Design a protein around this ligand. Structure first.
Ligand SMILES: *[C@H]1O[C@H](CO)[C@@H](O)[C@H](O)[C@@H]1O
Ligand SMILES: *[C@H]1O[C@H](CO)[C@@H](O)[C@H](O)[C@@H]1O
Ligand SMILES: *[C@H]1O[C@H](CO)[C@@H](O)[C@H](O)[C@@H]1O
Ligand SMILES: *[C@H]1O[C@H](CO)[C@@H](O)[C@H](O)[C@@H]1O
Lengths: 121, 113
């Protein structure tokens, strides 16, 4: 009896979800053990770039943007998005909020420009 | 004829990732073949330790009053955040666009202030 290879099996699972991985398919040498050639073959898979994953920062608190409520006032809040090219959303995180505080007075020096013109009304 | 044999395995080549898991190959050559028994290449995983947390800061939000000042002065505040990702390359981490919402607060309750 001469040695022979079984037919190639299916391509198995890819090592990466995206950004490039490899996968294998296999076969068996019968009546061997030393058939010519190799019992496993590899190819690349999922070579497309990973998608952009997004996470939003918390909103800042609603605060006035005007220092007077003459007939009402406007309020605003802000937020950003954090983005990364990843396969796992657990690897992207929004870090700790930082806050700064200053006091604005009439004859002040903290560098405020908000209600300067209100004195003229 | 001439004796057919495999050269010794070369060294493992460069890992496809520096962290978070990649693959690397090593190779050998069938001499006086070409039908050597076995494989001319092998692959293994490498650099499976987690990538470091790389960080980028958002821009500061605008300085805004804390509340409507009944007295002469008022406090103002602003904020910023950090974006973090486990990566080797900081270019793959980005701070996105700033979103701004605005409402008008008056005597009625039509805007939820
Ligand atoms: C299996 O590998 C190839 C066929 O795919 C040949 O060298 C031979 O048939 C071997 O048994
Ligand atoms: C597997 O590889 C190809 C088929 O994809 C052929 O050379 C043969 O069928 C082998 O078993
Ligand atoms: C090379 O591969 C193995 C040794 O590592 C054997 O099947 C044989 O020596 C071949 O030439
Ligand atoms: C490479 O693989 C092992 C050594 O790592 C042995 O089977 C032989 O030295 C081959 O060339």
């Amino acid at each position: 009896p001469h040695m022979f290879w079984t037919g190639w099996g299916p391509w198995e699972r890819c090592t990466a979800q995206c950004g490039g991985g490899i996968q294998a398919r296999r076969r068996i040498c019968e009546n061997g053990p030393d058939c010519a050639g190799c019992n496993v073959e590899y190819q690349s898979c999922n070579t497309n770039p990973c998608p952009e994953l997004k996470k939003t920062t918390p909103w800042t608190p609603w605060t006035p943007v005007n220092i007077s409520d003459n007939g009402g006032h406007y309020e605003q809040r802000f937020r950003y998005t954090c983005k990364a090219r990843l396969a796992d959303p657990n690897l992207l995180e929004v870090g700790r909020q930082r806050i700064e505080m200053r006091y604005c007075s009439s004859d002040g020096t903290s560098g405020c420009s908000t209600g300067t013109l209100e004195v003229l009304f």
